[PDB]
Amino acid sequence: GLVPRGSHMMSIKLNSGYEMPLVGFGCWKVDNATCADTVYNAIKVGYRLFDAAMDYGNCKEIGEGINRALDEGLVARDELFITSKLWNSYHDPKNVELALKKVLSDMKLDYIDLFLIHFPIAFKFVPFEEKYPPAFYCGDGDNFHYEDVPLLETWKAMEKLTKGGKAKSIGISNFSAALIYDLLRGAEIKPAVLQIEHHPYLQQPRLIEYVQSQGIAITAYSSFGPQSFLELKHSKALDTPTLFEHKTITSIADKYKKTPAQVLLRWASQRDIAIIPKSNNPDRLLQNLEVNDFNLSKEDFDEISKLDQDLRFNNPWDWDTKNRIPIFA
Amino acid sequence: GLVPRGSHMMSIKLNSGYEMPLVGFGCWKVDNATCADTVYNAIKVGYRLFDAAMDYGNCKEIGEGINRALDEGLVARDELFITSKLWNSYHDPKNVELALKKVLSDMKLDYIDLFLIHFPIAFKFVPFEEKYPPAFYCGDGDNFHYEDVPLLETWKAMEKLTKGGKAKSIGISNFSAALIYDLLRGAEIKPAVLQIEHHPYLQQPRLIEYVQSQGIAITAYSSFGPQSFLELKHSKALDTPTLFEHKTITSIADKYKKTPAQVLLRWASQRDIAIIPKSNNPDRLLQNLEVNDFNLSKEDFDEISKLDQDLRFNNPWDWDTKNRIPIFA
């Protein structure tokens, strides 16, 4: 804690007054059977932020790993930054507090550090005891059904959660800039964080610029582009040249004795965009944490900028073929 | 009125129950000194829809041209379809009815057929007697200032206008699909029309698909792409290959003995997207009206589809360099 180089301890000061680590551990598709051990060892290795969600179905296991490290005194609770996300089924204001209480109960925590609206999409509510996580289930087989709940109504409910301190900060995910522009017109509390798909194939620079100009922090997901989606046989990801072998990336990695993956992560964090790389592998765990001790050059950013092709892998358009979800159209 | 070919009489049935002509006359940059004569002669030539806006500054002259044709009995009022648009300064609900009354007073009409929210942008109100049209003026020199009025609040005010019948139908313009998706959650009356920039360089196909699937009609503007903007020395438009000389377009025009301009217009109207070509020239007036009597082929649509490059000329991002307006980011 005394070497004057960049490290995994660097943080962003949120507009709520709390610090958020720039580098955290992503929990999507972290396997249930081993998730607690993975989270515990990530804490041992030095991870302090964990990016969870109601949708991910491993909330209890994440909590077991956290509470093991807390019980052993490896870390204090206030050193950890726990993020969760309100799923689409729970946008009705009357269900927002219920959803947070469910997260806290599952994770066996008194509070979470950041609660995000996971998507600007409002599914018909499904009771916890009918299906949890409900995922795409809307009470009627495979058919999607939706609730007429404007985003601002959900947001006002999220605002009330900060007052009791059970969610220290609140934010949004997968909102376009146009939606954020309208939301702030009705917001008493600005979102602290926007979390979005972000990688060199999908750079959305004007979204980044507008949102950061508002003092809203940005967290990138799927920083390795198509990689996260190969195991799901995402046809577009299967057909996309890997960022790990792309000549623009590898030639930059060659300059700094870093891996392509480390360049892809630092490309975000050096621009004050937080990252949450995911791995079930305890060997890339450390490489993904130690990305802030080198700097890309201005020419490197210029070169990486050329890769933008508006290639989006996580697009709800593909979920419901009867009622297309147009949040990124 | 008895030849069984497509013509300028074709219309779209709006979800409000009223018919809207597929081909109308656009009034942006129609010069004030000659606007009344131009509108009157357009009615003589057979135009029935006129696309006006508070921002355009020629509302009185448009009304003079209309009322001349009505006084001479060239047309009845119910044969005309008059569109106007609520400017950004008037999004506060208390100012929405005021704005419609201003339009009716200027145009000397009892009602308009379609009132659109011109942009999802809320400027600080400026009184009519201080500046009309206010354009970008927000009460403070060149500085922009804004109102914290969520779009749904403005929309509810537009909804009330339909009840008194002074606006037969209501709609929106320059809204992204994500904004429309949220608006419909709060709407009692769905928008009848979305009006957007639309041409082969900016095809936004998923926006078109989602919006039409909702039963909302679409009106294209700037169907000739960069052409409208050359007189304003729009640097991007000045650097853009004209659609009139683009080989994909000219080769299609060559098949049907039509001009490139006629192909560009029919490309929209054949897909049930209404068009509003503008001309101060009384000779292209007729060519722009007579576009529905030929059909493009499926291969032609395939070829024109390839021109899409997300090239947007009318982008409010460029208006305010201090507070970037991110509605299309």
Ligand SMILES: NC(=O)C1=CN([C@@H]2O[C@H](COP(=O)(O)OP(=O)(O)OC[C@H]3O[C@@H](n4cnc5c(N)ncnc54)[C@H](OP(=O)(O)O)[C@@H]3O)[C@@H](O)[C@H]2O)C=C[C@H]1SC[C@H](O)[C@@H](O)CS
């Ligand atoms: N807000 C949202 O909607 C979502 C948020 N997340 C969050 O982001 C975390 C990370 O994004 P991931 O998509 O999990 O993928 P990513 O980190 O890009 O890459 C993971 C894959 O890369 C391999 N890997 C890791 N480290 C590597 C190194 N150093 N070198 C090479 N390859 C590396 C991993 O393989 P191992 O596990 O075998 O190592 C992976 O294959 C997420 O975890 C989450 O916290 C992401 C997406 C969405 S939520 C998803 C969706 O919206 C659903 O909720 C609804 S359908």
Ligand SMILES: NC(=O)C1=CN([C@@H]2O[C@H](COP(=O)(O)OP(=O)(O)OC[C@H]3O[C@@H](n4cnc5c(N)ncnc54)[C@H](OP(=O)(O)O)[C@@H]3O)[C@@H](O)[C@H]2O)C=C[C@H]1SC[C@H](O)[C@@H](O)CS
């Ligand atoms: N909703 C909005 O925000 C806006 C709506 N409009 C509306 O659309 C009408 C038409 O779009 P235009 O931009 O006016 O331009 P367009 O018709 O594409 O082309 C006009 C130019 O093309 C030439 N021309 C006409 N006919 C031709 C033929 N047959 N062959 C070749 N060239 C042709 C014209 O030249 P002449 O006048 O010399 O013939 C033109 O040069 C608009 O009229 C309006 O009703 C459009 C834009 C926006 S509002 C604008 C902006 O948002 C401001 O309000 C705020 S900054």
